Amino acid sequence: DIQMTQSPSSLSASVGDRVTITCRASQTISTYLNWYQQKPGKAPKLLIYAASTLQSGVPSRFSGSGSGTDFTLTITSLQPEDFAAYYCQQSYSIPLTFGGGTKVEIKGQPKAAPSVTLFPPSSEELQANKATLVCLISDFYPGAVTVAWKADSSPVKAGVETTTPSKQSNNKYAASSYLSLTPEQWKSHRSYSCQVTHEGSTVEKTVAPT
Amino acid sequence: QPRGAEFHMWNYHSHVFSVGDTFSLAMHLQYKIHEAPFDLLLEWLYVPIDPTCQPMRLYSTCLYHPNAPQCLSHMNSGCTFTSPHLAQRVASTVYQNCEHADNYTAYCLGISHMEPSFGLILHDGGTTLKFVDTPESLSGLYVFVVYFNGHVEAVAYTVVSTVDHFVNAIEERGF
Amino acid sequence: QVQLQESGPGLVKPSETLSLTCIVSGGSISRYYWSWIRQPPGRGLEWIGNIYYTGTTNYNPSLQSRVTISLDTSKNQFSLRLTSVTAADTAVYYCARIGGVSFGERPIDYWGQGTLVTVSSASTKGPSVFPLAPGTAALGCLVKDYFPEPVTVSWNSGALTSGVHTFPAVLQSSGLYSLSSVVTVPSSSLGTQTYICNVNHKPSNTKVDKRVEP
């Protein structure tokens, strides 16, 4: 088993920057590795074969170089579509092995204010003996945010199910959160509030049972 | 600037077969050659495998070193793959004084002489064995070695055996 | 321009024999290697084994006693069998091809779609779908209380592509999963187009359409 070490693990560069990732092997593998790009959810695609040759249908900004025990993949100018992860895989010796992977994150997006929306539970779910409400903030770039739930006057700490997508073609995030509770407690309170704090003033939305 | 030659052949194969099969053991040689007057020697060797040796220790970095006294003194080639001289020749194909190197090997047709101790109909290029109506006795470890101008350039082991007495092989470097 | 499709089960109980079948189209089968590759949900992907068109099966030695690869050239397919599946085998399995004819050209060029295989001690559960009605407008669909994670969400049979977000699944302490898919649309385009979200759950083999409207 030839160990393959891929560096760095995670990097963040703005749009158009030159991205360089290194791959090292335990033994000499002459021009016998390939670089693959795996977008989140999708299957990995072949980027470079023979460690220096471009696969048909790949933009020329991806370049592979090196030989022996040292190899390098270079993205000439980053684009909002190159957000995927990259792997280097050897083919010289069985078992053919892959690298640890490198997460290239785009940092070219200036701080975007999230767009906030609130959705109260539907009647069908209330008939299904469960009460879940959804608070969504979409199209914001910077890191992570804080969202709190108000039971008409008070922060509730439990029942918050927070999820985050991967970077999109606009390099923006979307935090979604579910608040789950029984229909009795859903109807026992009047004004449910979702409060979001990110990059400006503190925003909040409210729902009432109309 | 360029000098020498390079070969690669994926040095790990396994094949499982039933008795009476007509399977073909085919290997994929990949090569780049310079200095057009060269000599090729594609050689198939065999060694019977003993089920009592679960790890078949192939000391692979022995074929490249020609006269290591430490290699050919394992008291026998019982279940460890020592120097290729301790194995038995099965197939030999020689491209002697070949000149047209830059393209397909179908332009430098050479000979393939095989020892009739085995059956093993030989096929294109002498890079593949075609086993016809095989008895159980032929099970063992077959190895493919390529001599370029007298030196080993690539070697790929392949384990051929039935389901009943099938043994794995672990490649090792040194000793 | 060849395509590969996996047709294996989504859920397998522990200490069983996982079986997958990869079906190929476009080329035929012949002069290429055919391989299977594993990838844990978060970790990097690893190689399991590959097969030539005439036997010649190369196996990853870390897991060799448990894996078998068969070929069905008559049906243009190749099958993978893994006996005694443990908890660690829960992963995405891809079937792909290895080719190239040059000194160093041996890439994994054409990959398959891949399928998720998970091991647990249950049977299945169908998803529950709920609509979520409204600068611009936003509308969503919520999927709740469904077993193994692979689930696909489209809008109006895939006609609505841009401006759609499909969040990853979260784990509800009832041992279930939850997911939400949202769409942002122009304010004036609310009452004209009919918005329907289609949810497909392959492990339960359930396709459900939900219309969203205030």
Residue numbers in the entry:
A (entry chain L): 1 to 210
B (entry chain A): 305 to 479
C (entry chain H): 1 to 82, 82A, 82B, 82C, 83 to 131, 139 to 218
Copy the relevant paper text.
Glycoprotein E (gE) is indispensable for viral replication and cell-to-cell spread and is the primary target for anti-VZV antibodies. VZV gE is a type I membrane protein, is the most abundant viral glycoprotein expressed on the surface of VZV-infected cells, and has also been shown to be the primary target for antibodies (Abs) elicited after ZVL vaccination. Critical for many VZV gE functions, as well as for VZV neurovirulence, is the formation of a non-covalent heterodimer with glycoprotein I (gI), an interaction that is conserved among gE homologues. Results: The 3D structures resolve distinct central and C-terminal antigenic domains, presenting an array of diverse conformational epitopes.
Initial attempts to crystallize the gE_FcBD:5A2 Fab complex resulted in a protein crystal with high mosaicity that diffracted X-rays to a maximum resolution of 4.3 Å. This structure was solved by molecular replacement using the gE_FcBD homology model and a model of the 5A2 Fab as search template models. Visible electron density extended from the gE_FcBD N-terminal residue Gln305 through to residue Phe479 and covered the majority of Fab 5A2. Despite the relatively low resolution, the electron density was sufficient for placing main chain and side chain residues, particularly at the antibody–antigen interface. The overall fold for this domain consists of thirteen beta-strands (named here as β1′–β13′) organized into three beta-sheets, two of which pack in the center and form an Ig variable-like fold. Three naturally occurring disulfide bonds, which are also conserved in HSV1 gE, are located between residues C357:C383, C366:C375, and C402:C412. Strands β6′ and β13′ are not part of the Ig variable-like fold; rather, they are located on what appears to be a flexible extension away from the more tightly packed Ig-variable-like core of gE_FcBD and consist of several loops and two single turn α-helices (α1′–α2′). Fab 5A2 recognizes a large, conformational epitope, burying ~1000 Å2 on the surface of gE, mainly localized across beta sheets β1′–β4′. Interestingly, we found that of the six anti-gE Abs that were selected for this study, only one, Ab 5A2, recognized the FcBD.
